[PDB]
């Protein structure tokens, strides 16, 4: 109860979900007009991903992506189907990125990836051909046009010299160059969030909203072109990259911020940066817990005010030991296990204490998140005219996939902010690889 008292902290009532809810839906308005565009601590910023194309190209596409800890390469074949394009991964593989690769410059990082997508050629009996490519870059991108914009900044513990400020694709292209290896047509160059929202259209016309709750935590939908006043136009639809993991930055969430958030914020690799992301996202989340196990041993109430080498290290506990607490059937061999290899030596009460501090870091994680989607439903809403809005949620990411709970309260969360909204969820089947494939065919169509 002393235990109840601290971690309760981490409770939200519905009225500040609400609120939470109201400001994100106001902070979006912010991103979206040219007034306000550039300050906006919520960029909104436009995909040219629309709705409105018709026709696509078939064949074989590259697809890349970049913005896990992992680097993939795949080929996907998309051919003709009913009422539109199928597609499916036919190869793929995947690279680690080194730490000299990433302290370094940009350039050296697209060399790089140059030299992991020489060597998939290889494999694949590939390097010869030239295809067209499509990168999912899970980063915030200022666009010109579906093959063309700007990285704004890292996030998620990205460093790379030179990057910033930078054409991405320009970056890709002459990386690609500098090789003279291979030959490649890089036509378009998209988020997770579309990847994965693209990925879902396909078995469901629905699907207007895209989601990544993973290491980092962001949502993009299909907003009205006349909202979009930052590319003219009034007609049909286009994507909108919210990048809502920003949301906060502006100070929105200042009452809502906790000791451990602060905390969080001030020893990552991006300061004042990124504070909606840093409550909800993978990246954070075991630090999170972390940190509040630590204030529990220095109040005496855990493994008896002891800590170990390992527990007083950051970043030591991973957010998969967040999950694999949780997962524990109440034998507590999963717990006991998970912080015996941290270098303790928890009783039952310790167990079931870092059992409590999981839930209320994950439940407040489940919490945040429902309520900035609920926004970006509810702002939806406004433009619909049907009785019910039935829409279509497209997710990826493995702290939403994984988590033993997390998808089951932010459902219901989600579901309890939105009424008059029938809100279907659907997880990606390789959404990144397919969706940059899938909007690379429709601007072939065109642009190649
Ligand atoms: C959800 C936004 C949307 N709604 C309605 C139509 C298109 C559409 O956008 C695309 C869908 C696909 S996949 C697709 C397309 C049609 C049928 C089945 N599958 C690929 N690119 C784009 N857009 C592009 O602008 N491509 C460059
Ligand atoms: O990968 C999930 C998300 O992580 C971070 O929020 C990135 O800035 C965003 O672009 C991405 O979509």
Redesign the pocket.
């Known amino acids: 109860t002393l235990v109840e008292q601290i971690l309760a902290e981490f409770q939200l009532q519905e009225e500040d979900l609400k609120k939470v809810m109201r400001r994100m839906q106001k902070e979006m308005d912010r991103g979206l007009r040219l007034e306000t565009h550039e300050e906006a601590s919520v960029k909104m910023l436009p995909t040219?991903?629309?709705?409105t194309?018709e026709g696509?190209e078939v064949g074989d596409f590259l697809s890349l992506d970049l913005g896990g800890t992992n680097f993939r390469v795949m080929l996907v074949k998309v051919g003709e189907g009913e009422?539109?394009?199928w597609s499916v991964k036919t190869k793929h593989q995947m690279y680690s990125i080194p730490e000299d690769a990433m302290t370094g410059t940009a350039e050296m990082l697209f060399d790089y990836i140059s030299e992991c997508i020489s060597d998939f050629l290889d494999k694949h009996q590939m390097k010869h051909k030239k295809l067209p490519l499509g990168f999912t870059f899970s980063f915030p991108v200022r666009h010109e046009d579906?093959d063309k914009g700007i990285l704004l900044n890292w996030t998620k513990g990205f460093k790379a010299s030179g990057a910033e400020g930078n054409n991405v694709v320009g970056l890709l292209r002459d990386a690609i160059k500098r090789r003279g290896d291979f030959e490649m047509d890089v036509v378009?160059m998209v988020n997770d969030t579309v990847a994965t929202?693209?990925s879902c259209?396909?078995e469901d016309?629905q699907?207007?909203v895209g989601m990544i709750v993973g290491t980092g935590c962001n949502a993009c939908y299909?907003e009205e072109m006349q909202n979009v006043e930052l590319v003219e136009g009034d007609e049909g639809?286009m994507?909108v990259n919210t990048e809502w993991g920003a949301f906060g930055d502006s100070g929105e969430l200042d009452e809502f911020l906790l000791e451990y958030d602060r905390l969080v914020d001030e020893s990552s690799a991006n300061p004042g940066q990124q504070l909606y992301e840093k409550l909800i996202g993978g990246k954070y989340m075991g630090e999170l817990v972390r940190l509040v196990l630590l204030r529990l041993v220095d109040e005496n109430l855990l493994f008896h005010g002891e800590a170990s080498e390992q527990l007083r290290t950051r970043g030591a506990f991973e957010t998969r030991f967040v999950s694999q607490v949780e997962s524990d059937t109440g034998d507590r061999k999963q717990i006991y296990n998970i912080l015996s290899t941290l270098g303790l030596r928890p009783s039952t009460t310790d167990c079931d204490i870092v059992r409590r501090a999981c839930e209320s870091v994950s439940t407040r994680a489940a919490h945040m998140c429902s309520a900035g989607l609920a926004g970006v439903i509810n702002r939806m809403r406004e433009s619909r005219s049907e009785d019910v809005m039935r829409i279509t949620v497209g997710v990826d990411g493995s702290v939403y996939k994984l988590h033993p709970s997390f998808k089951e309260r932010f459902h219901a969360s989600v579901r309890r902010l939105t009424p008059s909204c029938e809100i279907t969820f659907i997880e990606s089947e390789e959404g990144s690889g397919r969706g940059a494939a899938?909007?690379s065919?429709?601007?072939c169509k065109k642009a190649c």
Do not use: D, K, N
Request: one cysteine or more; hydrophobic letters at 40%; a neutral charge.
């Open positions: 040219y991903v629309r709705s194309p696509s009422e539109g394009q579906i378009a929202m693209i259209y396909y016309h699907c207007e299909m639809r994507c899938l909007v065919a429709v601007a």
